[PDB]
PDB file of C-alpha atoms in Angstrom:
ATOM      1  CA  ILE U   1     -15.029  42.223-110.820  1.00  0.00           C
ATOM      2  CA  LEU U   2     -14.580  40.489-107.350  1.00  0.00           C
ATOM      3  CA  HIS U   3     -13.870  40.992-104.065  1.00  0.00           C
ATOM      4  CA  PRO U   4     -10.228  40.039-102.857  1.00  0.00           C
ATOM      5  CA  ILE U   5     -11.653  37.270-100.739  1.00  0.00           C
ATOM      6  CA  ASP U   6     -13.753  36.334-103.358  1.00  0.00           C
ATOM      7  CA  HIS U   7     -10.941  36.388-106.012  1.00  0.00           C
ATOM      8  CA  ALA U   8      -8.658  34.037-103.408  1.00  0.00           C
ATOM      9  CA  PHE U   9     -11.445  31.162-103.637  1.00  0.00           C
ATOM     10  CA  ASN U  10     -11.404  31.882-107.376  1.00  0.00           C
ATOM     11  CA  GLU U  11      -7.948  31.736-108.223  1.00  0.00           C
ATOM     12  CA  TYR U  12      -7.142  28.793-105.976  1.00  0.00           C
ATOM     13  CA  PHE U  13     -10.182  26.596-108.070  1.00  0.00           C
ATOM     14  CA  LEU U  14      -8.536  27.930-111.592  1.00  0.00           C
ATOM     15  CA  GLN U  15      -4.804  27.088-110.366  1.00  0.00           C
ATOM     16  CA  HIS U  16      -5.330  23.744-108.890  1.00  0.00           C
ATOM     17  CA  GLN U  17      -7.782  21.372-110.541  1.00  0.00           C
ATOM     18  CA  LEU U  18      -8.167  17.890-110.507  1.00  0.00           C
ATOM     19  CA  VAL U  19      -8.018  17.341-114.393  1.00  0.00           C
ATOM     20  CA  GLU U  20      -5.216  15.778-116.327  1.00  0.00           C
ATOM     21  CA  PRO U  21      -4.794  14.570-119.992  1.00  0.00           C
ATOM     22  CA  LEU U  22      -5.762  11.026-121.286  1.00  0.00           C
ATOM     23  CA  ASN U  23      -4.140   9.094-124.087  1.00  0.00           C
ATOM     24  CA  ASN U  24      -3.691   5.396-124.953  1.00  0.00           C
ATOM     25  CA  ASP U  25      -0.675   4.661-123.157  1.00  0.00           C
ATOM     26  CA  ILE U  26      -2.396   5.409-119.801  1.00  0.00           C
ATOM     27  CA  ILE U  27      -5.232   2.801-120.572  1.00  0.00           C
ATOM     28  CA  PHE U  28      -2.791   0.379-121.417  1.00  0.00           C
ATOM     29  CA  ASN U  29      -0.788   1.056-118.103  1.00  0.00           C
ATOM     30  CA  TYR U  30      -4.249   0.636-116.100  1.00  0.00           C
ATOM     31  CA  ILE U  31      -4.816  -3.041-116.649  1.00  0.00           C
ATOM     32  CA  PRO U  32      -3.321  -5.283-114.331  1.00  0.00           C
ATOM     33  CA  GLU U  33       0.222  -6.996-114.967  1.00  0.00           C
ATOM     34  CA  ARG U  34      -0.495 -10.535-115.626  1.00  0.00           C
ATOM     35  CA  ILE U  35      -3.229  -9.718-117.889  1.00  0.00           C
ATOM     36  CA  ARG U  36      -0.710  -7.369-119.742  1.00  0.00           C
ATOM     37  CA  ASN U  37       1.724 -10.367-120.167  1.00  0.00           C
ATOM     38  CA  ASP U  38      -0.807 -13.016-120.830  1.00  0.00           C
ATOM     39  CA  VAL U  39      -1.184 -15.337-123.894  1.00  0.00           C
ATOM     40  CA  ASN U  40      -4.759 -16.456-122.925  1.00  0.00           C
ATOM     41  CA  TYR U  41      -6.234 -12.726-123.418  1.00  0.00           C
ATOM     42  CA  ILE U  42      -6.177 -10.297-126.374  1.00  0.00           C
ATOM     43  CA  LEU U  43      -6.256  -6.858-126.032  1.00  0.00           C
ATOM     44  CA  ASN U  44      -5.668  -3.923-128.108  1.00  0.00           C
ATOM     45  CA  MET U  45      -6.958   0.021-128.968  1.00  0.00           C
ATOM     46  CA  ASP U  46     -10.042   0.854-131.441  1.00  0.00           C
ATOM     47  CA  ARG U  47     -10.242   4.232-130.589  1.00  0.00           C
ATOM     48  CA  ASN U  48      -8.682   7.573-131.597  1.00  0.00           C
ATOM     49  CA  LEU U  49      -8.622   9.760-128.301  1.00  0.00           C
TER      50      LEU U  49
ATOM     51  CA  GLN K   1     -15.589  51.067 -99.928  1.00  0.00           C
ATOM     52  CA  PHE K   2     -15.507  49.718-103.394  1.00  0.00           C
ATOM     53  CA  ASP K   3     -12.286  50.757-105.151  1.00  0.00           C
ATOM     54  CA  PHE K   4     -12.616  49.769-108.967  1.00  0.00           C
ATOM     55  CA  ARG K   5      -8.589  49.238-109.360  1.00  0.00           C
ATOM     56  CA  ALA K   6      -8.445  47.027-106.568  1.00  0.00           C
ATOM     57  CA  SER K   7     -11.287  44.847-107.248  1.00  0.00           C
ATOM     58  CA  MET K   8     -10.878  43.854-110.870  1.00  0.00           C
ATOM     59  CA  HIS K   9      -9.131  40.904-112.226  1.00  0.00           C
ATOM     60  CA  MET K  10      -8.491  38.849-115.366  1.00  0.00           C
ATOM     61  CA  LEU K  11      -9.256  35.173-115.142  1.00  0.00           C
ATOM     62  CA  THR K  12      -7.885  32.325-117.410  1.00  0.00           C
ATOM     63  CA  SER K  13      -8.870  29.096-118.021  1.00  0.00           C
ATOM     64  CA  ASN K  14      -9.259  26.305-120.797  1.00  0.00           C
ATOM     65  CA  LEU K  15     -11.532  26.391-123.798  1.00  0.00           C
ATOM     66  CA  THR K  16     -13.409  22.982-124.259  1.00  0.00           C
ATOM     67  CA  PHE K  17     -12.470  19.567-123.018  1.00  0.00           C
ATOM     68  CA  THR K  18     -14.423  16.572-121.717  1.00  0.00           C
ATOM     69  CA  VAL K  19     -13.746  14.105-118.949  1.00  0.00           C
ATOM     70  CA  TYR K  20     -13.925  10.345-119.385  1.00  0.00           C
ATOM     71  CA  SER K  21     -14.645   8.049-116.624  1.00  0.00           C
ATOM     72  CA  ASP K  22     -14.559   4.255-117.157  1.00  0.00           C
ATOM     73  CA  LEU K  23     -11.334   4.015-118.647  1.00  0.00           C
ATOM     74  CA  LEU K  24     -11.872   0.370-119.509  1.00  0.00           C
ATOM     75  CA  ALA K  25     -14.602   1.014-122.041  1.00  0.00           C
ATOM     76  CA  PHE K  26     -11.787   1.830-124.772  1.00  0.00           C
ATOM     77  CA  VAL K  27     -10.238  -1.644-124.191  1.00  0.00           C
ATOM     78  CA  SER K  28     -11.289  -4.533-127.349  1.00  0.00           C
ATOM     79  CA  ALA K  29     -11.053  -7.998-125.263  1.00  0.00           C
ATOM     80  CA  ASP K  30     -10.722 -11.183-126.816  1.00  0.00           C
ATOM     81  CA  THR K  31     -10.303 -14.770-125.712  1.00  0.00           C
ATOM     82  CA  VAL K  32      -8.508 -17.607-126.982  1.00  0.00           C
ATOM     83  CA  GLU K  33     -10.526 -21.159-127.270  1.00  0.00           C
ATOM     84  CA  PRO K  34     -10.570 -22.799-124.059  1.00  0.00           C
ATOM     85  CA  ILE K  35      -9.352 -26.246-124.991  1.00  0.00           C
ATOM     86  CA  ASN K  36      -6.273 -24.113-126.061  1.00  0.00           C
ATOM     87  CA  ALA K  37      -5.748 -22.534-122.906  1.00  0.00           C
ATOM     88  CA  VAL K  38      -2.128 -22.965-121.264  1.00  0.00           C
ATOM     89  CA  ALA K  39      -0.966 -21.772-117.841  1.00  0.00           C
ATOM     90  CA  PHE K  40       2.688 -20.191-116.706  1.00  0.00           C
ATOM     91  CA  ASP K  41       4.677 -22.733-118.291  1.00  0.00           C
ATOM     92  CA  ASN K  42       3.108 -22.639-121.607  1.00  0.00           C
ATOM     93  CA  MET K  43       1.826 -26.017-121.288  1.00  0.00           C
ATOM     94  CA  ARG K  44      -1.715 -26.623-121.455  1.00  0.00           C
ATOM     95  CA  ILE K  45      -4.188 -27.156-118.408  1.00  0.00           C
ATOM     96  CA  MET K  46      -6.172 -30.141-118.783  1.00  0.00           C
ATOM     97  CA  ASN K  47      -4.200 -32.515-120.347  1.00  0.00           C
ATOM     98  CA  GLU K  48      -7.083 -35.274-119.598  1.00  0.00           C
ATOM     99  CA  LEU K  49      -8.426 -35.010-123.206  1.00  0.00           C
TER     100      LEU K  49
ATOM    101  CA  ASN A   1       1.771 -20.278-140.343  1.00  0.00           C
ATOM    102  CA  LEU A   2      -1.926 -19.676-140.629  1.00  0.00           C
ATOM    103  CA  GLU A   3      -2.688 -22.472-138.525  1.00  0.00           C
ATOM    104  CA  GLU A   4      -0.706 -21.248-135.515  1.00  0.00           C
ATOM    105  CA  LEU A   5      -2.375 -17.614-136.456  1.00  0.00           C
ATOM    106  CA  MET A   6      -5.549 -18.825-136.030  1.00  0.00           C
ATOM    107  CA  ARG A   7      -4.847 -20.750-132.575  1.00  0.00           C
ATOM    108  CA  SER A   8      -3.600 -17.942-130.738  1.00  0.00           C
ATOM    109  CA  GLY A   9      -4.864 -14.760-132.608  1.00  0.00           C
ATOM    110  CA  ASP A  10      -2.053 -12.321-131.754  1.00  0.00           C
ATOM    111  CA  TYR A  11      -2.688 -10.543-135.198  1.00  0.00           C
ATOM    112  CA  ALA A  12       0.209  -8.214-134.011  1.00  0.00           C
ATOM    113  CA  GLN A  13       2.985  -9.420-136.681  1.00  0.00           C
ATOM    114  CA  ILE A  14       0.443  -9.564-139.644  1.00  0.00           C
ATOM    115  CA  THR A  15      -0.660  -6.285-138.895  1.00  0.00           C
ATOM    116  CA  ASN A  16       2.769  -4.606-139.071  1.00  0.00           C
ATOM    117  CA  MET A  17       4.074  -6.126-142.356  1.00  0.00           C
ATOM    118  CA  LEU A  18       0.385  -5.633-144.216  1.00  0.00           C
ATOM    119  CA  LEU A  19       0.655  -1.784-143.150  1.00  0.00           C
ATOM    120  CA  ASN A  20       4.297  -1.042-143.716  1.00  0.00           C
ATOM    121  CA  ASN A  21       3.915  -3.770-147.224  1.00  0.00           C
ATOM    122  CA  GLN A  22       6.679  -5.871-146.760  1.00  0.00           C
ATOM    123  CA  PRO A  23       6.971  -9.262-148.289  1.00  0.00           C
ATOM    124  CA  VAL A  24       5.289 -12.031-147.221  1.00  0.00           C
ATOM    125  CA  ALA A  25       4.319 -15.793-147.850  1.00  0.00           C
ATOM    126  CA  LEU A  26       1.312 -16.957-145.858  1.00  0.00           C
ATOM    127  CA  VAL A  27       1.443 -20.578-145.579  1.00  0.00           C
ATOM    128  CA  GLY A  28      -1.809 -22.886-145.289  1.00  0.00           C
ATOM    129  CA  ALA A  29      -4.342 -24.616-146.973  1.00  0.00           C
ATOM    130  CA  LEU A  30      -6.505 -21.728-148.285  1.00  0.00           C
ATOM    131  CA  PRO A  31      -9.745 -21.709-151.041  1.00  0.00           C
ATOM    132  CA  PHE A  32      -9.237 -19.347-154.044  1.00  0.00           C
ATOM    133  CA  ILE A  33     -11.412 -18.287-156.976  1.00  0.00           C
ATOM    134  CA  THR A  34     -10.465 -18.309-160.924  1.00  0.00           C
ATOM    135  CA  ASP A  35     -10.286 -15.063-162.615  1.00  0.00           C
ATOM    136  CA  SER A  36     -10.010 -15.351-166.589  1.00  0.00           C
ATOM    137  CA  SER A  37      -9.830 -11.772-168.156  1.00  0.00           C
ATOM    138  CA  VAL A  38      -6.925  -9.245-168.781  1.00  0.00           C
ATOM    139  CA  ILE A  39      -8.675  -6.226-167.738  1.00  0.00           C
ATOM    140  CA  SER A  40      -9.220  -7.683-164.009  1.00  0.00           C
ATOM    141  CA  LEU A  41      -4.974  -7.718-164.289  1.00  0.00           C
ATOM    142  CA  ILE A  42      -4.511  -4.715-165.906  1.00  0.00           C
ATOM    143  CA  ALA A  43      -6.571  -3.095-162.922  1.00  0.00           C
ATOM    144  CA  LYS A  44      -4.333  -4.345-160.078  1.00  0.00           C
ATOM    145  CA  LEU A  45      -6.852  -6.488-158.765  1.00  0.00           C
ATOM    146  CA  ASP A  46      -5.341  -9.093-156.709  1.00  0.00           C
ATOM    147  CA  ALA A  47      -3.896  -6.885-154.019  1.00  0.00           C
ATOM    148  CA  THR A  48      -7.210  -5.789-153.091  1.00  0.00           C
ATOM    149  CA  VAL A  49      -8.038  -8.878-151.144  1.00  0.00           C
TER     150      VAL A  49
END
């Protein structure tokens, strides 16, 4: 039960929010490019998301 | 004045989630022995040994 | 080659062949044990290690 002004600020907060899903692919595309393609460094994923 | 039909709404969101900062904690990191380290040309640096 | 595997340490091609149970011949000097009983053979024990 909200005023029409008070609903306008609350529908904007529900529809537009900064939060987006994560997986193992986004973390792998987050480290820089030389370390992605280096032989001196060894990297893998050891946790389910 | 207070109109009930014009001031009641039905709001929609998610049930649960978790937000993770510090994405690089899901990354296991190891390193080759430093005597066996090579540069870009796949040839060993410190050929002095 | 186990020695080249110990040097770099990628463990990507050997995790693939051991999860998808493809036939492999690992090459390198290795210490073993000697087991002399039949019930330890009837129980398929050598595939455990």
